[PDB]
From TrEMBL:
This is DNA polymerase I. CTP 2 binds at R319, Q360, A362, H386, R406, K410, Y418. GO terms for molecular function: 3'-5' exonuclease activity; 5'-3' exonuclease activity; DNA binding; DNA-directed DNA polymerase activity; metal ion binding; nucleotide binding. The chain holds residues 299 to 878 of 878 of the full protein. CTP 1 binds at E173, D175, R176, L177. The lineage of its organism: Bacteria, Bacillati, Bacillota, Bacilli, Bacillales. It catalyses: DNA(n) + a 2'-deoxyribonucleoside 5'-triphosphate = DNA(n+1) + diphosphate.
DNA sequence: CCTGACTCC
DNA sequence: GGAGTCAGG
């Protein structure tokens, strides 16, 4: 059964062929400044295992890695590329990434290792990484013979699977999406991750000191009001205090007990002074635990930067996600939380943070795909879309739209953009499911093209088995035929929503590629730091801001051409907070 | 590991 | 809705 390979003591020329499957193995989950434990190369001449201390000190091997004309096929090339960047080594010529190929073919398979990808093509001559390295505390790199066989089997699987994966991508009309969008993007994400974002840790620490004082004060008030100490962070002890001791109304349950979500608590505040204090304690506690202490824990001491990892192969809509830290959920809506952004600063003296965001990209994409005459006209006039939606839903003029009317319309728009259910919209607006349905009905009367689109896309999903985005990203929807109303309805909502969210993801990814090219052409030092779904964050010398003010929005706006314009807003300043 | 809560888009 | 993190259990 064993797979033959050369356990090489040195690099030879036959290992440096112009086409190879390459494995550069980084076992730590967070690959920043992490060890490379082994290397495997499979090519027309054979299968090879190399020790990294050897290969990575060999000038011929390093040249080969960096030579764009030497083509490599890999799985999760970004992990290898970043780990190699920390060692001062450039990885070029990666022409196929099996992780990104599998992700595009079917994001729902949850492919996160070579074995899982291989199984899509009935190839099982490779073990799952979890089986080799173990999990959790028991996780460890195995002895060399076991390690080397595993890496060689992964390389062999990649070597064999490239053709069938590319063939299926071609059949799906997704090969350009892989080769021209996701693969080039992977390189850009690697650069962003490696650059990192500078943190003003002293400022974070000062905030933490103040929060600790405020938390102690509120905490003690809560105990006084409760007539008893308890763990406020325990949903169980808190529920006992609120709903048994203090006898507050139970307005909502969880599957295991009493709900204490903020929405519920706000409704209970009139009955007892403890409630507003718990809400305040929660708010401060979230900041302290997640955005002060949690952030400080992942700052690299050598440079005071944080280096996120963008998971490019996870979400079902084509979005990225961000981990360790997550830099896509830093507070902004409320001022107390927004101040956390003062801690994210430029990495060089006399540089600034520049932030550019699409204005209503999801609803603009919807206008385009649905060809809804009224929605397209609204965006061609660059109307405030929530005010316009209120005018239409309520049949009033602009100067008759009250704040609460605009709020209801905005909630409907939020619902369309995220594909939430009537129940969800009812919750969000604190109204009956019945009234939520009525809102949706008025929306479709004013936007009949959107109605027709939603009908048609659900039918298309049922017929084809999947829906697609503008650039041919796919999502399979097997639950669309379910005889369970809730399950089916969830799938119908995903059919409606994925082309919206997913096409918006496609567009910003293309914009990132275009922007990186333009910055290089223009010889700017500006570079990308972060993407937050519909916005891009850069830093640059202060002397580049005026140019960026023209260049960045233009590139973002021109990434695709739709039936409506795209519009990008932008700001800059001395910290991320000030880039507003 | 699971639940519940909460932060962003 | 759907990502990730925290805390509790
Ligand atoms: N072999 C292909 C063909 C297309 N695409 C993706 C990227 C393209 O930018 C996008 C749009 O393709 P087209 O411009 O070719 O449009 P089509 O002719 O395919 O029709 P439609 O876009 O309506 O599907 O689809 C792809 O990834 N691989």
């Amino acid at each position: 059964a064993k797979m033959a390979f050369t356990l090489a003591d040195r690099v030879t020329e036959e290992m440096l062929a112009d086409k190879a499957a390459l494995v550069v193995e980084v076992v730590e989950e967070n690959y920043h400044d992490a060890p490379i434990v082994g290397i495997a190369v499979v090519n027309e001449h054979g299968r090879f295992f190399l020790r990294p201390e050897t290969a990575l000190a060999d000038p011929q091997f390093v040249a080969w890695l960096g030579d764009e004309t030497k083509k490599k096929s890999m799985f999760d090339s970004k992990r290898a590329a970043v780990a190699l960047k920390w060692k001062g080594i450039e990885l070029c010529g990666v022409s196929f990434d099996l992780l990104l190929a599998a992700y595009l073919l079917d994001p729902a398979q949850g492919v996160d290792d070579v074995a899982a990808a291989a199984k899509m093509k009935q190839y099982e001559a490779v073990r799952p990484d979890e089986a080799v390295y173990g999990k959790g505390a028991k996780r460890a790199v195995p002895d060399e013979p076991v390690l080397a066989e595993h890496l060689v089997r992964k390389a062999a699987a990649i070597w064999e699977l490239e053709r069938p994966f590319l063939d299926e991508l071609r059949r799906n009309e997704q090969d350009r999406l892989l080769v021209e969008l996701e693969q080039p993007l992977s390189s850009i994400l690697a650069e962003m991750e490696f650059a990192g974002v500078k943190v003003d840790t002293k400022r974070l620490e000062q905030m933490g000191k103040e929060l600790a004082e405020q938390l102690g004060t509120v905490e003690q008030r809560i105990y006084e009001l409760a007539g008893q100490e308890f763990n406020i962070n325990s949903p169980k002890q808190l529920g006992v205090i609120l709903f048994e001791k203090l006898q507050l109304p139970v307005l909502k349950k969880t599957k295991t007990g009493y709900s204490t979500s903020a929405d519920v608590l706000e409704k209970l505040a009139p009955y007892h002074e403890i409630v507003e204090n718990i809400l305040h304690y929660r708010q401060l506690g979230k900041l302290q635990s997640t955005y002060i202490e949690g952030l400080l824990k992942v700052v690299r001491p050598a440079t005071k930067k944080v280096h996120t990892i963008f998971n490019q192969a996870l979400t079902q809509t084509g979005r990225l996600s961000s981990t360790e830290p997550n830099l896509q959920n830093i507070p902004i809506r409320l001022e107390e939380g927004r101040k956390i952004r003062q801690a994210f600063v430029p990495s060089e003296s006399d540089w600034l943070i520049f932030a550019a965001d699409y204005s209503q990209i999801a609803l603009r994409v919807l206008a385009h795909i649905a060809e809804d005459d009224n929605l397209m006209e609204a965006f061609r006039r660059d109307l405030d879309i929530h005010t316009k939606t209120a005018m239409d839903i309520f049949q009033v003029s602009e100067d008759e739209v009250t704040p609460n009317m605009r709020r209801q319309a905005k909630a409907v728009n939020f619902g369309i953009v995220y594909g939430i259910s009537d129940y969800g919209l009812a919750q969000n607006l604190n109204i009956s499911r019945k009234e939520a349905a009525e809102f949706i009905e008025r929306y479709f009367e004013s936007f009949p093209g959107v109605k027709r689109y939603m009908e048609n896309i659900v039918q298309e999903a049922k017929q084809k088995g999947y829906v697609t985005t503008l650039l041919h990203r796919r999502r399979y929807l097997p639950d669309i035929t379910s005889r369970n109303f809730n399950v089916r309805s969830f799938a119908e909502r995903m059919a409606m929503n994925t082309p919206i969210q997913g096409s918006a993801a496609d567009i910003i990814k293309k914009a990132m590629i275009d922007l990186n090219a333009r910055l290089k052409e223009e010889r700017l030092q500006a570079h990308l730091l972060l993407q937050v779904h519909d916005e891009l964050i850069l830093e640059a010398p202060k002397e580049e801001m005026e140019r960026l003010c023209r260049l960045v929005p233009e590139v973002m706006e021109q990434a695709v051409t739709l039936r409506v314009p795209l519009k990008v807003d932008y700001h800059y300043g001395s910290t991320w907070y000030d880039a507003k």
